[PDB]
Write a protein that binds this ligand. Structure first.
Ligand SMILES: CC(C)[C@H](C[C@H](O)[C@H](CC1CCCCC1)NC(=O)[C@H](CC(N)=O)NC(=O)c1ccc2ccccc2n1)C(=O)NCC(C)(C)C
Lengths: 99, 99
């Protein structure tokens, strides 16, 4: 692949067969997605940004599959208008930011 | 070339000659730098983030030098918990997200 940033990096990933449309965010440290069943083994946490805090639920070791690559990362469940795939996943996907 | 997302993408930049430390955020439409005086040619704007919406003072055609590039882009001042260089500078700088 290769992504020009004239339009937000929007991709389709699978959070265990569950298709979701996620944003390629080099600025997030963690990743958040909505309306996903990930089970009962979660870690309650709050995250802060611009505008304040939100409560998520951390699920470690969730297998994902994006851009023809399979990764096993950590995702949290919070309510966001848009799902984010921060660096935890980008670094795993083997993603870089070039010039 | 490329770079890694292991390292959180933090850089130093001169925002109209003030060295400012910023975060290369390819999941941000805009540029929000906190506590800097840019003048009187503003225009209040509204930016949305994860935790909510913050009120900002919009400054256009601001002179920016980052990663050894001179570029003039719209800078937004505000209450961001962290200074970000949105995709509006990422297009300008000619950056792309590769895999
Ligand atoms: C503050 C930083 C460092 C980082 C912010 C992200 O890059 C972050 C991710 C999401 C984008 C979509 C809406 C949810 C938040 N981006 C942003 O906060 C940028 C800032 C900007 N205006 O340039 N926001 C936006 O680009 C943006 C526009 C669409 C929106 C629609 C509705 C509500 C909010 C919206 N925010 C962050 O908060 N990380 C923590 C994490 C991953 C838990 C959010």
């Amino acid at each position: 692949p290769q992504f020009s940033l004239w339009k937000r990096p929007v991709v389709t990933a699978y959070i265990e067969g569950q298709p979701v449309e996620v944003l390629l965010d080099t600025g997030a440290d963690d990743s958040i997605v909505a309306g996903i069943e990930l089970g009962n083994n979660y870690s309650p946490k709050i995250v802060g940004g611009i505008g304040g805090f939100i409560n998520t639920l951390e699920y470690k070791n969730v297998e994902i599959e994006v851009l023809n690559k399979k990764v096993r990362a950590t995702i949290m469940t919070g309510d966001t208008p848009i799902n984010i795939f921060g660096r935890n996943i980008l670094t795993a996907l083997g993603m870089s930011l070039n010039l």
